[PDB]
Every structure is written in structure tokens, then in C-alpha cells.
């Protein structure tokens, strides 16, 4: 489901597919980093369900 | 530690490592070290006929 899904964050159309994955975005070891999260959701949950 | 990748094959590298170390004629029952082999006269099948 879209609850548990495994995505690719590299967005490289040059080397593709499945080799855009397996490569890492390497931040520097010298600095301690920080990330701002900004999410967007959509749902279709009914009132009464199992 | 274990960052395993889909491009890597963790299997079939142990198959080639073991063929480098020992032979594949011995049946070591701990690791279920038993070797797949066809019968040699069934694949090629000489047809020399009955005596």
C-alpha cells in the first residue's frame, strides 16, 4: 500500500532504471546536517470500516 | 552495518567461493553441502546398443 512503500530519490534520467537507485546522496562528514520535512496527504477513508 | 543491494548477489558468490576451496564430490551434511549434478549418460546419452 501507500503506507509502506520504497521510493527512489535520485531523479537521474541519464542512468536509469534501477541504477538510478542503489546510489547514495553523500552529505559531508564534517558538518552535522538537518532536514526540514514538508508532507502532502490524500485519503478516502469512510466513516464505518473494518 | 548490512547495507545490502539488489545488484549484489550474496548467493552464487558462496557457490563459487566453495568451489575454489574444496571439491564438490563430498557430501557434508552440516551445511547441506550436497551438489546438484545430472547423470552423465542421460544428458549426452551414447547409444552403443545392447550386448
TrEMBL record, chain A:
Q: What induces it?
A: Expressed in the late phase of the viral replicative cycle.
Q: Which domain of life is it from?
A: Viruses
Transmembrane annotation, as ranges: none
Compartment(s) where it occurs, according to its Swiss-Prot or TrEMBL record: Virion; Host nucleus
Q: Which family does it belong to?
A: Belongs to the adenoviridae penton family.
What functional role does this protein have? Major capsid protein that self-associates to form penton base pentamers, each in the shape of a pentagon, situated at the 12 vertices of the pseudo T=25 capsid. Involved in virus secondary attachment to host cell after initial attachment by the fiber protein, and in endocytosis of virions. As the virus enters the host cell, penton proteins are shed concomitant with virion acidification in the endosome.
**Additional facts recorded:** All late proteins expressed from the major late promoter are produced by alternative splicing and alternative polyadenylation of the same gene giving rise to non-overlapping ORFs. A leader sequence is present in the N-terminus of all these mRNAs and is recognized by the viral shutoff protein to provide expression although conventional translation via ribosome scanning from the cap has been shut off in the host cell.
Q: How does it assemble?
A: Interacts with the fiber protein (via N-terminal tail region). Interacts with the capsid vertex protein; this interaction binds the penton base to neighboring peripentonal hexons.
- Supply the name of the protein: Penton protein
- Give the species this sequence originates from: Lizard adenovirus 2
Name of the encoding gene: L2
Automatic annotation (TrEMBL), chain B:
Superkingdom: Viruses
Cellular location of this protein? Virion; Host nucleus
Q: Give induction info.
A: Expressed in the late phase of the viral replicative cycle.
Role: Major capsid protein that self-associates to form 240 hexon trimers, each in the shape of a hexagon, building most of the pseudo T=25 capsid. Assembled into trimeric units with the help of the chaperone shutoff protein. Transported by pre-protein VI to the nucleus where it associates with other structural proteins to form an empty capsid. Might be involved, through its interaction with host dyneins, in the intracellular microtubule-dependent transport of incoming viral capsid to the nucleus.
Quote the subunit structure annotation.
Homotrimer.
Per the record, the similarity remark reads: Belongs to the adenoviridae hexon protein family.
Q: What is this protein called?
A: Hexon protein
Protein source organism? Lizard adenovirus 2
Portion of the full sequence shown: 304 to 354 of 909
Amino acid at each position: 500500500d501507500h503506507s509502506n512503500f520504497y521510493t527512489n530519490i535520485v531523479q537521474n534520467v541519464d542512468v536509469a532504471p534501477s541504477d538510478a537507485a542503489t546510489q547514495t546522496i553523500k552529505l559531508d562528514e564534517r558538518s552535522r546536517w538537518g532536514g526540514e520535512l514538508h508532507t502532502i496527504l490524500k485519503t478516502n477513508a469512510p466513516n464505518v470500516t473494518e | 552495518i548490512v547495507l545490502d543491494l539488489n545488484d549484489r548477489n550474496s548467493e552464487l558468490s558462496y557457490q563459487y567461493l566453495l568451489a575454489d576451496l574444496t571439491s564438490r564430490w563430498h557430501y557434508f551434511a552440516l551445511w547441506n553441502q550436497a551438489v546438484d549434478d545430472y547423470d552423465h549418460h542421460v544428458r549426452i546419452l551414447e547409444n552403443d546398443g545392447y550386448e
